[PDB]
Amino acid sequence: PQLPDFIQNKIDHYIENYFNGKHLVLGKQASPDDIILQSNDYLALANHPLIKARLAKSLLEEQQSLFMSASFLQNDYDKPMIEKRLAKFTGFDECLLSQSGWNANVGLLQTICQPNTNVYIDFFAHMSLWEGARYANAQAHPFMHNNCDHLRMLIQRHGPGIIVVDSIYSTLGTIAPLAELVNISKEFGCALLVDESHSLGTHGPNGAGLLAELGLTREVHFMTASLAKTFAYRAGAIWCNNEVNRCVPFISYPAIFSSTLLPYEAAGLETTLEIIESADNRRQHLDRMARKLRIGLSQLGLTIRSESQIIGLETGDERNTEKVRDYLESNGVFGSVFCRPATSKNKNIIRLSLNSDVNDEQIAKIIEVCSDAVNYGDFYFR
Amino acid sequence: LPDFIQNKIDHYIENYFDINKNGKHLVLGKQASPDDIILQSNDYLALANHPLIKARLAKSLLEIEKRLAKFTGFDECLLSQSGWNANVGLLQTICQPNTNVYIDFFAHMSLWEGARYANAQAHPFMHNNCDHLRMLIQRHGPGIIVVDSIYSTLGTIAPLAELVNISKEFGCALLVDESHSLGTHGPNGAGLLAELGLTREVHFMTASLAKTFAYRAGAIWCNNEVNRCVPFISYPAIFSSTLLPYEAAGLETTLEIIESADNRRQHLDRMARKLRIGLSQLGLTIRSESQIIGLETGDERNTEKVRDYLESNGVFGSVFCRPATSKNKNIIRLSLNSDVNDEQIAKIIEVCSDAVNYGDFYFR
Numbered sequence A: 001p002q003l004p005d006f007i008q009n010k011i012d013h014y015i016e017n018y019f020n021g022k023h024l025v026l027g028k029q030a031s032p033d034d035i036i037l038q039s040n041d042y043l044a045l046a047n048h049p050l051i052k053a054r055l056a057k058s059l060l061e062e063q064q065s066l067f068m069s070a071s072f073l074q075n076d077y078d079k080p081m082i083e084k085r086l087a088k089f090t091g092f093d094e095c096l097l098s099q100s101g102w103n104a105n106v107g108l109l110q111t112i113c114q115p116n117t118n119v120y121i122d123f124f125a126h127m128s129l130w131e132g133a134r135y136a137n138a139q140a141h142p143f144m145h146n147n148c149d150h151l152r153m154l155i156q157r158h159g160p161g162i163i164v165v166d167s168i169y170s171t172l173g174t175i176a177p178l179a180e181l182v183n184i185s186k187e188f189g190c191a192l193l194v195d196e197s198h199s200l201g202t203h204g205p206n207g208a209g210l211l212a213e214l215g216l217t218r219e220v221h222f223m224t225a226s227l228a229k230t231f232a233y234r235a236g237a238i239w240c241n242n243e244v245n246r247c248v249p250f251i252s253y254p255a256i257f258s259s260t261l262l263p264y265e266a267a268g269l270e271t272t273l274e275i276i277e278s279a280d281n282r283r284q285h286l287d288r289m290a291r292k293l294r295i296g297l298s299q300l301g302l303t304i305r306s307e308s309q310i311i312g313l314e315t316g317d318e319r320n321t322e323k324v325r326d327y328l329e330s331n332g333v334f335g336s337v338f339c340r341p342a343t344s345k346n347k348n349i350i351r352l353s354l355n356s357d358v359n360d361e362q363i364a365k366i367i368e369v370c371s372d373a374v375n376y377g378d379f380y381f382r
Numbered sequence B: 001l002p003d004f005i006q007n008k009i010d011h012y013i014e015n016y017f018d019i020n021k022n023g024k025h026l027v028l029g030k031q032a033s034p035d036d037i038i039l040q041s042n043d044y045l046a047l048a049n050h051p052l053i054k055a056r057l058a059k060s061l062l063e064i065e066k067r068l069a070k071f072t073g074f075d076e077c078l079l080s081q082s083g084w085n086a087n088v089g090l091l092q093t094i095c096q097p098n099t100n101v102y103i104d105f106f107a108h109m110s111l112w113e114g115a116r117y118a119n120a121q122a123h124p125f126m127h128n129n130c131d132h133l134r135m136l137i138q139r140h141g142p143g144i145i146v147v148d149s150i151y152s153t154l155g156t157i158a159p160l161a162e163l164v165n166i167s168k169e170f171g172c173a174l175l176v177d178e179s180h181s182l183g184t185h186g187p188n189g190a191g192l193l194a195e196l197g198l199t200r201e202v203h204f205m206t207a208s209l210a211k212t213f214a215y216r217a218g219a220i221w222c223n224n225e226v227n228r229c230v231p232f233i234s235y236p237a238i239f240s241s242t243l244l245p246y247e248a249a250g251l252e253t254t255l256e257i258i259e260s261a262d263n264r265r266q267h268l269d270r271m272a273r274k275l276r277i278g279l280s281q282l283g284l285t286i287r288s289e290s291q292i293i294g295l296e297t298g299d300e301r302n303t304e305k306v307r308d309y310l311e312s313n314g315v316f317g318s319v320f321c322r323p324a325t326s327k328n329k330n331i332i333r334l335s336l337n338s339d340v341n342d343e344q345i346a347k348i349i350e351v352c353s354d355a356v357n358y359g360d361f362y363f364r
């Protein structure tokens, strides 16, 4: 057929302005011996034999034609035991499964927001959190990253609202000042929403997360997480210390108008949970390696804001980012490009995601290859 | 928690749970038995528990875009985590804040939300009403016409050939959501566009893969270059994790089974017609022309009584109420699948006959 001008032109303009000939996030194919640091599989559970075996197992013997929205399966007898188990693991009263972390955030915010509702959101909070509030026509008030003072001032000005943060930030790998945020939430009669996508499983007792580690669990209204990180699965979940998960399934558009996880998917998650709560060994190893890399990189003078297994190289503009990218990939390092719309146009990041399979030798190489880039150079860092 | 949330939640529980006789949301009925008649699943060719498909999935989990594009006749196919995501991402890619989107009143909520997320200018046209559409485009300019090939609640069929002509006449792009026709309709299940010989004049087609394909995913088909751009523009495509590679393998087997399921299609097509005719002659309005039959039950209170009646007598039954429908135009949807029996069909007709009427409630 023939696309209307009002589309062809958008396509043409985009291709010319965004597409080395490929989109910035696409570099060169990597070799087996290269060090790949792109997966959110922090405990390297992707290929765990017990998980795969249990998925395969339940996947046999279905009824189980439950192709319909989860809203129709909110009777007790239809709700997966993995919800109760995730709730107990985490310390929250209730858990609700979602089709993704994105959906968990959009759905939860739709359930708890009115168009008038004040939403105080960290400037670096995940896009799903920005979008959920926007979809709800909430009044978003962003505060400077991890800046509690600014937050305080904002709430002073606009009144009670929902405070929304990532526990660990997906781009920069920094950690929210969660204890202070709980105090502020109490000081002003707000509700707190913490996205633990990058801390659930890697942090806390048995990996119960950062809120459990700091003993804040009972003090927080809501917690969300993609289960597609440490849990290594395409789903999400909403935890509530209240009765909000009773309503979400009937209010959230993604919960209502998109199909639910199949029963066998939940069964896998149960086994994943068990493996995760026993994985003290990989947690420790991952914590230690990330610190080594952090320290390694902070010497050298690089801006390394991280306090976690996520490390962001701040590489300025797209041109300069391409250059860094090519340089790291030319050596053994990959390497995930964060650019618009995820970042501001000239504040791009090449994220290094560590996992518990990375070893001492590999860190060293990464530091060395970064030391070379600084400043065998050819490009800059912010 | 804080009043501004507590107040909202209390009101909601009061006006959506407490008012029903079981104290539950309206969609929540009684527990089915074997062998009550269950008509809720969207798995139209009853593939959910197919031996081969399960085998292929497990196999690949231990240890397709091209095929789907060829299957359907479109130039390109791009996979998505859901039909919802497919629609939302497609709309986000081709829309600008300015764009006219001409959308059938009953088109799936994902298309509505997709246009809205993109800040498009939505122009609702009355269900399957081409005159209304003609007027709106004359008034507002070129834009994207968006329809369900088969509508999710009513089971009506879009007037596709006439929409193709309208789009050509008025310089519009056309988006067809084939979620409820892909696999059940057309040559080897290629769908309604294919059945009608219209594939080559539609710009875009989308589909949940969670109906006939019995899988949690979606796809976007393009007769142009858009699928090259969707992956770097759509928020669901950017900020939400992808399908794992073994998931795609399952779809390949599924596709093969669907391609060969001429038998199941035919039986389903026949059962649906038998039901449509049986229910119509009772004087219920039955707009459907497919395996989706909408019992029109008016208001929530009446709907509750209708569904309690049906379930009490072995028929289930998916309630569609706000926000899926108007407050006063609820539907109890019967979704047929290829496993459904003649005897079961007669049984449904019988139960609705007694229903129309034991008194107690009405149908529209």
Ligand SMILES: Cc1ncc(COP(=O)(O)O)c(C=O)c1O
Pocket (backbone or CB within 6 Å): A257, A258, A259, B081, B082, B083, B084, B085, B087, B108, B110, B148, B152, B177, B179, B180, B207, B208, B209, B210, B216, B217, B218
């Ligand atoms: C017409 C239509 N499009 C899209 C969807 C959503 O598809 P999915 O459940 O894969 O998100 C549905 C919902 O059932 C639908 O009926």
Ligand SMILES: Cc1ncc(COP(=O)(O)O)c(C=O)c1O
Pocket (backbone or CB within 6 Å): A100, A101, A102, A103, A105, A126, A128, A166, A170, A195, A197, A198, A225, A226, A227, A228, A234, A235, A236, B239, B240, B241
């Ligand atoms: C903090 C945070 N929340 C939510 C998400 C979305 O998770 P999902 O891919 O399961 O939709 C992500 C990124 O994927 C994230 O980094």
